[PDB]
Design a protein around this ligand. Structure first.
Ligand SMILES: CCCCCCCCCCCCCCCCCC(=O)OC[C@H](COP(=O)([O-])OCC(O)COP(=O)([O-])OC[C@@H](COC(=O)CCCCCCCCCCCCCCCCC)OC(=O)CCCCCCCCCCCCCCCCC)OC(=O)CCCCCCCCCCCCCCCCC
Ligand SMILES: CCCCCCCCCCCCCCCCCC(=O)OC[C@H](COP(=O)(O)OCCN)OC(=O)CCCCCCCCCCCCCCCCC
Ligand SMILES: CCCCCCCCCCCCCCCCCC(=O)OC[C@H](COP(=O)(O)OCCN)OC(=O)CCCCCCCCCCCCCCCCC
Ligand SMILES: CCCCCCCCCCCC(=O)OC[C@H](COP(=O)(O)OCC[N+](C)(C)C)OC(=O)CCCCCCCCCCC
Ligand SMILES: CCCCCCCCCCCC(=O)OC[C@H](COP(=O)(O)OCC[N+](C)(C)C)OC(=O)CCCCCCCCCCC
Lengths: 243, 654, 90, 55, 124, 174, 83
């Protein structure tokens, strides 16, 4: 949780704080190399998610794909891209440790095996867990009013400013991020309950507490991203170099 | 009392309260609650449509700021235009009748709390989709209706095909969602805003190439949700969801959203001809393609889903002719039609003790079910544009407008649209013949136990039969006048061919679809009873052809083996041969082998000798020899000593 | 209270004291936001023109529409870094 | 013809009480600031905002 | 074994049984399995690239050979667009003139300037 | 605050020495041996000491305490899993709910409230007021207009002049 | 059907055939909350609504067009179709 919520966003912070102030005249010469590597880590990691046997590993490669969306708003030389990268970084820091809770806390503490093939039909014995799994699935993709879409949208828009053809193939990430996530979600949610899994306890009060907080805090940024523009309106204008 | 707000707030109450209080209220209460609250929403919007004919003065409501950033603002804005009230009355009518219908159709099903909840949120995000007043609120409703379609098609989570079918539906809609995000990024780039009022005020000034790019992306979105040929499978792969769900998602609503995207952007579709051209020919393709599937398939729900997507092409042809009142009027009457079709179909599936769907096993049911018969025949006669019903007024004037348009090429799609109309007869005759008129095919006991459905199933069919009879004669003055100021869209003065189309028709071209849609219908009937060998030949060639048209003009196969399965193989190539294969050879799995070999060599360098003293004493000699020779080589030329050191490293470390 | 800090520029100041460089930085920043609010004011007036005009918005406010589409490339956040790292006419 | 009822549950579950109480409290406090701003020219929580002057 | 990528995976596997990949859908449904939904017995060896041969795999139609179905699909495609493109030549002319407009084609009405009469203008 | 007794706690340990381990004390699938242990579960539930004792007293008492609470803790929760024990009620407080609903949740609501009202002081509200101020500074005669006209009149100047001064900052370009 | 189900599980939307004994009593509370919430949100969004056409007087729009023409003359900007 501390890794994928905070360390990746720490390096997203370090590309702003350390590079964009005194490497500006360098940075313009190299934005196409960053766009090569950013598009090529959005397409090719989100495509490697489809062939996975393990279950925490899928949410890991999901985090790779979202940071790959995030950094092409940083190097976008735009107000929109910088603000979208910040709102993506903060909203992914909310939504992603909840997913690592769903694979790691509610689902590895009970059965101690993380292979996907064992898990089927979790709805009929755990309805409110399946409720979580679907509404945290859809919050991950870029389905709006969640703050993940605000980050993805303003990042793709800022990446479309700086180079339009890189934004054209960068925009298919909305599709590619939905494929593996809903392919996981319908395998966990539906079917006859699995013959391997014996029935265990419903989600406890502490886990529901963590989940409710990490979902409200996405929904508030999703309904109104202006709640934290009071901090950034300096630092959205700061890193821009348009002579 | 606020009319613009209670259209929004009342289906939000009808969704939040079934989930938060379903365990506390119970199914018997939440049925009637969700029902009556959508009923009063529907009554409020009829009364607002009655007000709006008095003065064409729309009402909007304003909310807080979504995002303020430099050149871009997004507000939550909600405005009922005449186009908006047109779609709104249709979707609230179909919604409320499907709520009343599914009270009685689902009374044996367990989980109808969650079911009536999800029906209401489907209606609610449809409301927000229609009444939004920028391109952003359109996007919010546009995504969440696909989310609801996931949650609705997969209502039986136990069934495997329902889960895979909801997966297919959502991933098609998400393909379209990605192209709309592309188009929306270009919208906010070029115009600097997402509001309809600013974009339409400056749409005529903007460059045409940008305009083609934008409307191409937005049309690929609309083509995905309004089910044209590029991805058309997911409608008929959405029959795993139940009957009132499929009465919502296919009659009006989820279909109508993709047409609404083009009906909004009509003001920015005028100024490009290339996009409207491509729109016209995709729609003219799918009229023919869906009719040719619907002739040869045999499940009842499949035939009505294909009957749906044959007319989506007709509305798309009406888009391509730059005639948006025609497409809007057909979109209006088509909802009432198809909802009565799907609910008559669900009434005869529900009445059979088998609950089968094969029309080959229904048999004659005319004397046993007279009410569902008279409903489904009003719907099929309206469906074939038999005159005096609103299908005449919605449907035949589009076929007229194909010939009446100014451009030459439109003549061809006349015949294509015309061909579909004859096709529109024949399968409908099949789904009126083999389930009411034919000799019985089912065993005798379901003919003992065939009985009439409840009052909750009967009354929406009654009300929508009355609507599908009278709606076109009532609302034709509104949408098809000689000159009408109701819909505020602005046709370019030369793309407007409506005065031209009514007068330039010869007697033959207007008389011709009427008389032949009559004659081919009576033809298919009279050839089904008396002979029944023309359709039951056993030529080897007609069976291959029939099996092509049966399996969705082999489309699903051409989608699955060559895109889905090849995509999964090339994603399995990356996750093994690239991700775990070659990036680890430059990563931690090849460096281990490199360091293993190099360390083994440099440790065995001092291995061989029995005596350590003679080995180290001969190793002190080689260095002060070899270093000295290197420096001899080195001051002369530095280039001729680099390979010497590479080779010394090769022999030392390997 | 609506306080108004004073405008200073990048060229007269010394860059060795930080008090004046930060003021010039914030000044150029806030002026871009003022310029942007002028753009937003014309966008609001163009929307009101369209909604009042109805069908004859092509000729009622051709000038307001042309005004908006001429302001849009040149009225946005531009960044202080580009002007303070580089000097024109030197 | 019977409904065949399951056992009785109370309406005001603890979650309904918590979520409704916090949401109605936030909305009531927001209306309290909008009413307090018309009387005095500033919101109530702005009295607690004490940052240093920029100079 | 049967597919080409399954043969491409063969030199990688070591001490793994290398069984024949068979679709879990094209198993018959009436034999009793442990999981009826998976169509799979309790300890049955899972294939080289299992999740393409799963129940959650693609639909994998069986009535046409896939190369043949490729030909039939592209055949219907090509015959429609060829028939429409050839039928553009056998078209009749229309009987009316495209209609004209007052005030020199409403050029002042659709924005316009006297120098910009050609870009925003109608038939007159 | 409260106080504990030493002798009661020694007698508690003397009770615990004659007792079976927690891995045996409930695995017998009644009241001969199972009735002395539910007492001990209530002995875990009751709290022996407050804040005034822990500061002032030595570590031998504290080690004796910690051993007692660990054994009582096992005897409470093992008996709760196998089977006061033989009840089933709803009212209960897990250890974390004291300082997550009463400190974590209100500080998070306080973070929401200060973010919402701190958003009033934004550059866009202030820049709109500043641009209106500059228009009123250059042309004060629109002060003399009544209330509804003045805003509209201000817009007629915002369109009629740039009022930035951004070309005046860039005095090195011309 | 009415197959048997386990009663240990608790779902917020009710479970399989959720029908509590006091559903009229709870229905009274739910109608109270629904009617009160609908009336309160309908009255709260009343001043945020406005008519579409006729909000500001036409003389203002003609003046705004005049100021647009002044600002366009000062910068010497040509029309779109002037080339
Ligand atoms: C408007 C303003 C409202 C703002 C939001 C208020 C949140 C309220 C929190 C609360 O009530 O306390 C609960 C919360 C703990 O939750 P919990 O209930 O104790 O859960 C434990 C048990 O599970 C609970 O018991 P359980 O065991 O039974 O668990 C069952 C679980 C159910 O199990 C599930 O499956 C849950 C399913 C998933 C739900 C999780 C998402 C929550 C959904 C949100 C609702 C959205 C509705 C749609 C949109 C509507 C818009 C309003 O319970 C639920 O989750 C049900 C929730 C829904 C109940 C709603 C009932 C309200 C009815 C309202 C009636 C209106 C009356 C009007 C009358 C008018 C008369 C005049 O405690 C807190 O206070 C957490 C603090 C969170 C405060 C908000 C966060 C603010 C700060 C965010 C960060 C700032 C931005 C980011 C900055 C980034 C850096 C720059
Ligand atoms: C605006 C933002 C909207 C945010 C939505 C907030 C909704 C919060 C409440 C959702 C609760 C839904 C629920 O509790 O459904 C439980 C359902 C139980 O299944 P059940 O039919 O009872 O059968 C049980 C078999 N043992 O469990 C299931 O079967 C899974 C289906 C869950 C249905 C979820 C409905 C809401 C989904 C909203 C998507 C939001 C995406 C962001
Ligand atoms: C003007 C131009 C007009 C252009 C028109 C022509 C457009 C043709 C392009 C069509 C593209 C369709 C969108 C492709 C993604 C759709 C994903 C999907 O729907 O998967 C369905 C599949 C389940 O389907 P299935 O099992 O076969 O049947 C279930 C019913 N029982 O679900 C699954 O099995 C999930 C796992 C597979 C998911 C797919 C993984 C690979 C994704 C590849 C995407 C390729 C995108 C680029 C396509 C380029 C096309 C040129
Ligand atoms: C879900 C069904 C929809 C419910 C809609 C109910 C509408 C009630 C009346 C609206 C009043 C209003 O919002 O006013 C807007 C007020 C003040 O802005 P203003 O400038 O004064 O007015 C704007 C009108 N203009 C433009 C004409 C001037 O700002 C706000 O409140 C924003 C508060 C956001 C808090 C963060 C979101 C928390 C959500 C958490 C969810 C879990
Ligand atoms: C054009 C190509 C159509 C041939 C396809 C076909 O195979 O046509 C056969 C269909 C199916 O007839 P059926 O009622 O489903 O009997 C099913 C008995 N089979 C399975 C032996 C066919 O007959 C029709 O309705 C089409 C004839 C009317 C077309 C318009 C005149």
């Amino acid at each position: 949780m501390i890794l994928a919520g905070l360390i990746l966003k720490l390096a997203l912070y370090a590309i702003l704080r350390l590079l964009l102030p005194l490497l500006c005249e360098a940075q313009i010469l190299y934005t196409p190399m960053i766009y090569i590597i950013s598009l090529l880590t959005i397409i090719l990691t989100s495509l490697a998610t489809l062939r996975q046997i393990d279950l925490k590993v899928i949410i890991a490669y999901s985090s790779i794909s979202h940071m790959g969306i995030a950094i092409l708003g940083v190097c976008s030389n735009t107000s929109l891209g910088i603000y979208g990268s910040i709102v993506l970084g903060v909203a992914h820091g909310f939504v992603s440790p909840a997913l690592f809770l769903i694979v790691g806390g509610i689902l590895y503490d009970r059965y101690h095996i993380r292979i996907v093939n064992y898990y089927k039909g979790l709805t009929t014995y755990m309805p409110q867990l399946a409720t979580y799994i679907i509404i945290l699935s859809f919050a991950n993709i870029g389905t709006p009013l969640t703050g993940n879409f605000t980050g993805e949208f303003l990042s793709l828009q800022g990446g479309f400013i700086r180079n339009p053809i890189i934004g054209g193939i960068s925009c298919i990430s909305v599709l590619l991020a939905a494929i593996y996530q809903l392919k996981l979600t319908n395998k966990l949610t539906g079917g006859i309950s699995s013959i391997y899994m014996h029935r265990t306890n419903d989600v406890t009060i502490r886990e529901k507490f963590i989940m409710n907080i990490l979902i409200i805090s996405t929904l508030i940024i999703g309904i109104c991203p202006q709640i934290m523009y009071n901090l950034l309106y300096w630092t959205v204008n700061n890193y821009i170099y348009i002579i | 009392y606020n009319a613009i707000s209670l259209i929004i707030i009342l289906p939000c109450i009808s969704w939040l309260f079934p989930l938060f209080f379903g365990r506390q209220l119970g199914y018997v209460f939440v049925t009637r609650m969700t029902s009556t609250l959508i009923i009063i929403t529907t009554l409020i919007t009829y009364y607002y449509f009655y007000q709006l004919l008095g003065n064409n003065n729309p009402i909007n409501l304003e909310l807080f700021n979504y995002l303020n950033i430099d050149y871009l603002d997004i507000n939550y804005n909600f405005e009922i235009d005449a186009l908006t009230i047109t779609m709104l009355l249709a979707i609230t009518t179909i919604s409320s009748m499907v709520h009343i219908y599914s009270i009685g159709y689902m009374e044996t099903d367990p989980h109808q709390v969650r079911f009536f909840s999800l029906l209401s949120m489907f209606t609610f995000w449809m409301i927000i989709l229609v009444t939004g007043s920028n391109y952003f609120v359109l996007f919010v409703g546009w995504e969440f209706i696909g989310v609801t379609s996931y949650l609705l098609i997969s209502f039986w989570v136990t069934r495997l095909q329902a889960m895979k079918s909801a997966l297919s539906a959502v991933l098609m809609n998400r393909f379209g969602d990605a192209f709309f995000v592309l188009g929306l990024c270009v919208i906010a780039y070029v115009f600097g805003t997402l509001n309809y009022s600013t974009i339409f005020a400056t749409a005529y000034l903007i460059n045409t190439d940008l305009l083609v790019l934008i409307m191409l992306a937005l049309f690929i979105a609309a083509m995905a949700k309004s089910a044209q040929f590029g991805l058309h499978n997911w409608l008929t792969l959405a029959m795993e969801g139940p009957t009132p769900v499929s009465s919502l998602l296919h009659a009006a609503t989820l279909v109508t959203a993709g047409i609404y995207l083009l009906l909004r952007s009509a003001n920015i579709l005028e100024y490009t001809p290339t996009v409207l051209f491509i729109i016209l020919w995709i729609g003219a393709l799918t009229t023919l393609s869906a009719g040719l599937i619907a002739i040869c398939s045999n499940d009842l729900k499949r035939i009505i889903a294909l009957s749906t997507m044959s007319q989506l092409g007709m509305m798309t042809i009406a888009i391509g002719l730059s005639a948006y009142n025609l497409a809007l009027f057909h979109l209006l009457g088509h909802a009432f039609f198809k909802a009565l079709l799907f609910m008559s179909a669900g009434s005869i599936i529900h009445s059979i003790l088998n609950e089968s769907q094969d029309i080959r096993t229904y048999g004659g049911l005319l004397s046993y079910l007279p009410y569902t018969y008279i409903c489904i025949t009003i719907a099929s006669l309206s469906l074939m544009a038999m005159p005096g019903l609103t299908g005449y007024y919605t449907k035949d004037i589009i076929i007229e407008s194909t010939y009446g348009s100014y451009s030459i090429s439109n003549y061809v799609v006349y015949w294509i649209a015309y061909l579909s109309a004859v096709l529109t007869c024949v399968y409908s005759m099949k789904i009126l013949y083999l389930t009411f008129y034919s000799n019985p095919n089912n065993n005798t006991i379901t003919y003992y136990n065939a009985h009439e459905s409840n009052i909750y199933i009967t009354l929406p069919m009654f009300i929508l039969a009355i609507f599908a009879m009278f709606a076109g004669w009532i609302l034709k003055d509104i949408y098809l006048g000689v000159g009408t100021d109701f819909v505020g869209t602005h046709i370019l003065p030369n793309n407007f061919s409506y005065f031209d189309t009514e007068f330039s028709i010869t007697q033959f071209y207007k008389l011709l679809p009427l008389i032949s849609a009559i004659l081919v219908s009576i033809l298919i009937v009279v050839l089904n009873e008396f002979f029944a060998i023309v359709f039951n030949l056993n030529n080897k060639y007609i069976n291959t052809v029939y099996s092509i048209f049966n399996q969705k003009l082999v489309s699903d196969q051409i989608l699955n083996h060559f895109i889905i399965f090849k995509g999964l193989v090339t994603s399995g190539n990356i996750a093994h041969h690239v991700d775990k294969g070659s990036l680890y050879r430059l990563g931690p799995v090849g460096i281990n082998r490199l360091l293993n070999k190099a360390s083994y060599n440099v440790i065995n360098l001092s291995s061989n000798t029995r005596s350590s003293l003679s080995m180290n004493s001969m190793l002190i000699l080689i260095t002060i020899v070899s270093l000295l020779l290197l420096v001899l080589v080195m001051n002369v030329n530095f280039i001729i000593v680099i390979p010497v050191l590479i080779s010394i490293l090769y022999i030392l470390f390997s | 209270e609506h306080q108004r800090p004073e405008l200073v520029s990048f060229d007269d100041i010394n860059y060795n004291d930080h008090k004046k460089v930060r003021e010039a930085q914030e000044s150029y920043t806030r002026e871009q936001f003022i310029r942007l609010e002028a753009l937003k004011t014309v966008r609001k007036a163009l929307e009101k023109c369209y909604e009042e005009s109805g069908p004859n918005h092509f000729e009622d406010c051709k000038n307001l529409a042309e005004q908006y589409l001429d302001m849009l490339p040149t009225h946005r956040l531009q960044g202080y870094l580009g002007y303070q790292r580089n000097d024109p006419s030197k | 013809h019977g409904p065949e009822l399951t056992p009785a549950v109370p309406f005001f579950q603890p979650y309904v009480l918590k979520w409704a109480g916090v949401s109605l409290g936030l909305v009531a406090f927001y209306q309290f600031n909008s009413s307090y701003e018309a009387k005095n020219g500033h919101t109530w929580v702005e009295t607690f905002f004490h940052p240093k002057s920029r100079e | 074994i049967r597919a080409s990528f399954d043969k491409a995976e063969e030199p990688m596997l070591g001490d793994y049984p290398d069984i024949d990949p068979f679709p879990a859908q094209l198993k018959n449904p009436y034999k009793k399995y442990d999981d009826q939904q998976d169509r799979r017995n309790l300890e049955e060896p899972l294939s080289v690239n299992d999740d393409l041969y799963d129940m959650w795999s693609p639909d994998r139609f069986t009535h046409f050979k896939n190369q043949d179905a490729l030909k039939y699909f592209i055949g219907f495609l090509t015959i429609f667009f060829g028939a429409s493109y050839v039928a553009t030549y056998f078209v009749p002319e229309k009987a009316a003139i495209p209609r004209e407009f007052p005030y020199e084609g409403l050029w002042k009405e659709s924005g316009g300037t006297e120098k910009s009469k050609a870009f925003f203008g109608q038939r007159s | 605050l409260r106080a504990y007794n030493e002798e009661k706690e020694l007698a508690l340990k003397q009770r615990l020495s004659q007792l079976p381990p927690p891995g045996k004390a409930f695995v017998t699938a009644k009241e001969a041996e199972l009735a002395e242990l539910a007492e001990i579960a209530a002995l875990y539930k009751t709290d022996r000491v407050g804040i005034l004792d822990i500061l002032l007293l030595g570590n031998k008492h504290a080690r004796l305490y910690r051993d007692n609470t660990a054994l009582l803790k096992d005897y409470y929760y093992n008996g709760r899993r196998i089977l006061w024990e033989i009840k089933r009620e709803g009212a209960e407080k897990e250890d974390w709910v004291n300082q997550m609903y009463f400190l974590y949740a209100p500080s998070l609501i306080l973070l929401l409230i200060v973010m919402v009202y701190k958003s009033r002081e934004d550059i866009t509200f202030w820049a709109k007021k500043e641009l209106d101020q500059r228009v009123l500074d250059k042309h004060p005669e629109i002060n003399d207009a009544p209330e509804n006209e003045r805003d509209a009149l201000i817009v007629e100047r915002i369109i009629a002049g740039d009022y930035d001064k951004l070309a005046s900052l860039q005095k090195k370009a011309t | 059907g009415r197959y048997p189900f386990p009663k240990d599980v608790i779902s917020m939307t009710g479970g399989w055939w959720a029908n509590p004994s006091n559903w009229k009593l709870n229905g009274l509370f739910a109608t109270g909350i629904a009617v009160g919430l609908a009336l309160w949100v309908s009255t709260a969004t009343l001043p945020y609504t406005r008519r579409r056409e006729g909000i500001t007087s036409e003389s203002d729009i003609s003046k705004w067009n005049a100021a647009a023409g002044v600002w366009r003359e000062r910068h010497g900007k040509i029309s779109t179709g002037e080339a």
